[PDB]
Amino acid sequence: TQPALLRLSDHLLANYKKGVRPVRDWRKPTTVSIDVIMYAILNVDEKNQVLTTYIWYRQYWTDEFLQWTPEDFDNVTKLSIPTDSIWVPDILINEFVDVGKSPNIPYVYVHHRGEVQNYKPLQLVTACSLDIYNFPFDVQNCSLTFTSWLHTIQDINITLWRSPEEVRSDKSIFINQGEWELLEVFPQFKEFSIDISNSYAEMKFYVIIRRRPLFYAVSLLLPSIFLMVVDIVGFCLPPDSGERVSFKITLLLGYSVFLIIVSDTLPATAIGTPLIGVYFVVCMALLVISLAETIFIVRLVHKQDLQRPVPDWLRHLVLDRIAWILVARDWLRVGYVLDRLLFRIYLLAVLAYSITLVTLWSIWHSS
Amino acid sequence: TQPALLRLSDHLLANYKKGVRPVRDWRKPTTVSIDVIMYAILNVDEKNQVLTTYIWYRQYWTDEFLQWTPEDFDNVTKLSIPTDSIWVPDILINEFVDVGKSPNIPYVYVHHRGEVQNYKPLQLVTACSLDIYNFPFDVQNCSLTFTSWLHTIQDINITLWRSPEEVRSDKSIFINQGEWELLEVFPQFKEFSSNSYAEMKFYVIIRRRPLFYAVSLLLPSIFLMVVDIVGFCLPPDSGERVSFKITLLLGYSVFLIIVSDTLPATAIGTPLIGVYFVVCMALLVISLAETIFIVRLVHKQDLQRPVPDWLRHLVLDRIAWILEVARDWLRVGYVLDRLLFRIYLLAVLAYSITLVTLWSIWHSS
Amino acid sequence: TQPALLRLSDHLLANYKKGVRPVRDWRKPTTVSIDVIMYAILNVDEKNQVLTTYIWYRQYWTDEFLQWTPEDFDNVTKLSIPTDSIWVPDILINEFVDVGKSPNIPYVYVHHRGEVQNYKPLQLVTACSLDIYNFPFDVQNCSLTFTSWLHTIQDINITLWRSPEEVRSDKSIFINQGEWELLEVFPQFKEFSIDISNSYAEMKFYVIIRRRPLFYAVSLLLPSIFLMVVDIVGFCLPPDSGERVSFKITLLLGYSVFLIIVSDTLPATAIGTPLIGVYFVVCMALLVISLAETIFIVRLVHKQDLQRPVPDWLRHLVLDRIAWILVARDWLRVGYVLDRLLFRIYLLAVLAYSITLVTLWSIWHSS
Amino acid sequence: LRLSDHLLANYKKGVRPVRDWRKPTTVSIDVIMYAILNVDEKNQVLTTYIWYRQYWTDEFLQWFDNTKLSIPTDSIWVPDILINEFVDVYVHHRGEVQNYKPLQLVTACSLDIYNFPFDVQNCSLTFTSWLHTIQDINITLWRSPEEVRSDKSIFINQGEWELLEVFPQFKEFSIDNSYAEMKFYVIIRRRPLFYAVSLLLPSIFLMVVDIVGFCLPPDSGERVSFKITLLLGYSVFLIIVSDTLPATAIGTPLIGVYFVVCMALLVISLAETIFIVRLVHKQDLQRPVPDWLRHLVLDRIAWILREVARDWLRVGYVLDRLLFRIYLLAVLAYSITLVTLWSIWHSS
């Protein structure tokens, strides 16, 4: 006689009709139980707002027609059935933009007295909402939403196979050496109602994804800190002596290309460029202002030029400046007090920058 | 005895066939209704002139063969039925080149009195005129049309499910803050052109956000141009300014490299501001070559002539009027350098004016 | 007559049923025999987490239902069958994160008496833990793991079809050229349990590779050596009062752009920066401190400041430490002392950099 | 429309059509080299958007409905022919069948990035029979072998790669048991203009200005400042180099050797200048030497083929002129290299 698996697959599928939701009493909902195990954050595309994540996804649902007794079929207990030959739930991720190159699992595993298991892995290209105002210390929160695309809550209800205390902190298979460290996966449930009684049934997972700053802390933050602290130090060179002008020249001449590549490598989104990114633009501004000062004072010392005009705006400006801070020689005094003002501006800017970085790190570590 | 949904699904399908329209009066059209809400614009690329989108496309119709009375079928008011078995209106999207990885739902709803709904997301790749010329401030206008593949209007009529007011204003799920703002979706509907399909066209109008490119491109550009302006006249011309000029040329070379990774190489060539990048590179190269040339003469000094006498007269009569022997070549070089500096300042002014104009047109949209 | 050739299909295909694992008794395991042959690594990318590989891959198993004899027609000994029609063990690469549009051969080839042979080009994307710290002379170790989902060890069992050492030695199809050179491939089998009281069955390979440090060496390692030498000369030979500042800031900018180059070459990683990169940070910090100290002490206090001493700390330090280990004139003298101190530690840093590069090359070549 | 149903009922999708067994069956192939897209230049893969065409007379069926049919061959058997290095990708009543499809072949090839950016590469596409093959398989080539296809192709794209000679040749192989294959060899130019303006022009300008640096007096601190700023120039230039040059098994392209040569020459030139600025009357410390090396240095002034301080100034002068001469020789060797590479690239 034919083997039990053939006779059983005949007994089950020879009159099975997929599409009909598998319940004898139609008015009873089916109940569907889902788990996601995160495996890898393959990307977080800030520009496109797409988190691409690889997960391991399992469904469990009870089907009253795939129901049979081992006693009549050589005591066989499980079977493997082609996935497209039984009903499967309508559960799609809402915030989803590409099926991805997921490896398909063509069979689903079925257990006597009517049970179904389906295990499949999804290279989700999700869609997500991302904040880069903190950078590189961003703590980012991304959501996965699972819903019956047509079936209302009277037909499909969505449930967590593991308790919420353990879907969180699962981080078991997770390849935790990527750029992004998985902090938690947190699950939340909502009966979305679209109108008076056609409430849908929806399940939510939130995936909290903290950047590991250390590479960016070395590459972006430490070079910028050194070039800023050395530029402030340059003020200690005597005002507009040959050293000062040459120093400011070469410093601008290298820092400008450093800033080109830095401003390339910072992410950007419509929400805004990173908070540290405004301080690099501020350093661009203060470099420009510095060199534009030196060209004025260099002409004063170098040429027989600015010594010939008087400073036609009131000397009131000078006593005002010194009152806040504390004719060629009058021009030189103006240059000196302007240089001291610019140094004060640099020191303020670098204090604000370091306080910002420590604030961002405190926030990131508080998470 | 029999489960209600099974005997119902059998009763529907047992006499069903896809070879006939969903209507018994074969002469009448089926009245399809359509709706679209745009979810995301994933890419626009000049390389293929294609627009890649994601849309929650919806179909609605009535099937005169799917009537049933729930009072018989155990009060089942509605059923889910596999899309392979039921007839589906063969709408073809035109201006269309791939359906992509659309996670299609295998079932459609049906109800008592046979009204049908079919929701499927589509990752449409459309094709469009990508005049990127205004980059990065470009406003683009991409037609996304729907057509009957063979049904003449007398067989299928295509309608919106809801007023253009909501189809235009229902941006409610658009995943904003990406590179492209969805400015609007505009429905328009005319004959597909005796037997013509009732074709329809929703015009996807999308506006690039410059703030992505502000720091990536615009601010480094302006910074480099101001750097060159400040550097042009600070060093004396004999003061080995060649070192500054060459190192900044390297910096403008390391910049243009970053700017070709960024700037779209569309079929018309690079966008407008690529012209001002090339102009600035050219003027910088010219200034460097001038500085190199004059340094040779000022160190050589044994040159057999103090000036290019034929040109010197015009240089004085016009260039200086608009704005041992090695000293005269130095004077000529100084006048040329002042000319080139003024040309650079004019070029940066023109670039800034065009940038503000592009912003003004983009914001007026 | 000749369409009777089609008999050899029709007699099987009308009776075959993909849903059943093709064994005489379901208590029998099903036994699957594998060869994997390797085609150039297309890239290592996302250098913190991801590997991409191209492979030529074999399955053989016995099918109890494709049983037939050549005498049924003209002694036809072998036949080709579409995989659309035959049961296939769903042996996935467990590390999958993407699967790739290889030709994906439609057909599978079967012997008389129901031996079954499957040959397919296959393209893999794989998640792996990367020794980025020893860059550039790296010897990555990457894993490929093979298991059927849902199928227990009692359903599916996996074995090499070659000898183990034959797989390790067989590189015949590997095209040799590229940034990465495959070293050795190691095959291993074990078991695991996760959602079963018994266990699954697991067969794993350990592809090894070592990127050719030719381009990375010349580009970053060589110029770096030259610049470090340029600083080794620029520390001693320029006078302490001289225009050292422009030199040191220029080489600081040098190291900053080497950090840029590495950061472009090498994306964000859990390990902060390659061992070599850490030395660029150390050199940059030494340059920053040396430039700041020289600027303040000589170029304020000697050239411009009055005869203002700070004796006790300076005198104490020189008499206790420097005099063992070795006004304005004394400021210049302690300037020279600090120069020698910074020169000695910087020379030691150059020695450490050389020792690391020779130690990195030693490890790489010995792989 | 109507006649297809009995045809697709009487013969199955998935089995090789033939009138009789043991008869080998023969397949004919055509390719248009449509739009080469991007050479990875990582000496590994060759992305292309070829257009591929197949004909075979052997679909077993022949012929209602009043001559051409086009039921898609998702319903009909298709020959096994595939590209070998194949990473990531109508019918007539006489019984002869026609299929056209476009393939985004990633391919694989042994690139020869040595003349960079004036590359010419010779690169392979192979079409081969692997399973379901038949022992006596034979493969057939449209248009006369190496005829009509060889030249005047459609040439759709030039955005980065030019493309040139496409040589068809056909071959049969036996592993013990025989396979039949067609071989297509395709030849492409890099477009050098972008790389020329973005890398070669900065490079040659650095050669020129560094040569100009030798016009400054050998003892002057102006040389120190100049050379320092040019060392910054090269430091930033290495960003250009490391971005632009692709990784390769050979290490670096031939152009990319002269970069490190000039870097080394500049670096050693700094030490010379720094020594001579040290060996100046106010700070030379009269640093003595045992004269023999000094005479063997000074006599090079003849053997080409304060007053005490002048000794070291003359040493500095001769070292300067020697280093200038070796720098000049490197500039000429570079220029001749560029002219040679350009001439080769233009002639092919």
Author numbering:
A (entry chain B), C (entry chain C): 8 to 333, 422 to 462
B (entry chain A): 8 to 200, 204 to 333, 421 to 462
D (entry chain D): 13 to 75, 80 to 82, 84 to 106, 116 to 202, 205 to 333, 420 to 462
From the paper:
We demonstrate that the pentameric ligand-gated serotonin 5-HT3A receptor (5-HT3AR) can assemble to tetrameric forms and report the structures of the tetramers in plasma membranes of cell-derived microvesicles and in membrane memetics using cryo-electron microscopy and tomography. We purified the full-length murine 5-HT3AR in a saposin lipoprotein-stabilized lipid bilayer and performed single particle cryo-EM, as we previously reported. Further classification of the tetrameric particles, without the application of symmetry, resulted in two structures: a near-C2-symmetric (which we will refer to as symmetric) and an asymmetric tetramer. The differences in the conformations were observed mostly in the extracellular domain (ECD): in the asymmetric tetramer, the ECD is organized similarly to the pentameric form of the receptor with one missing subunit, while the second conformation assembles as an apparent dimer of dimers. Both conformations showed tightly packed transmembrane domains (TMD) with a C4 symmetry between the membrane leaflets.
In the apo-dataset 60% of the particles represent an asymmetric tetramer and 40% the symmetric one while in the serotonin-bound dataset, the ratio was 53:47. The extracellular domain of the chains C and D of the asymmetric tetramer are displaced by 6–14 Å outwards from the receptor’s central axis, leaving a larger space between the extracellular domains of chains A and D. The transmembrane domains of the tetrameric conformations were less variable, with displacements of 1–4 Å. The analysis of FES suggested that the transition from a symmetric (6.4 kJ/mol) to an asymmetric tetramer (3.6 kJ/mol) is energetically possible and is likely to happen spontaneously (ΔG = −2.8 kJ/mol ≈ −0.67 kcal/mol). The reduction of the solvent-accessible area and of the gyration radius for the asymmetric state highlights that the asymmetric state is more compact than the symmetric one. From the manually picked thirty thousand particles, a subset of 4431 particles generated a density map resembling the asymmetric tetramer observed in our single-particle analysis at a resolution of 25.2 Å (H and EV4E). While few water molecules were observed close to both the intracellular and extracellular exits from the pore, the central ion pore region (corresponding to the residue L260) of both the symmetric and the asymmetric tetramers did not contain any water molecules during the whole long-time scaled MD simulations. This analysis suggests that the captured structures are not permeable to water and ions. Finally, a pentamer is formed by adding a monomer to the asymmetric tetramer.
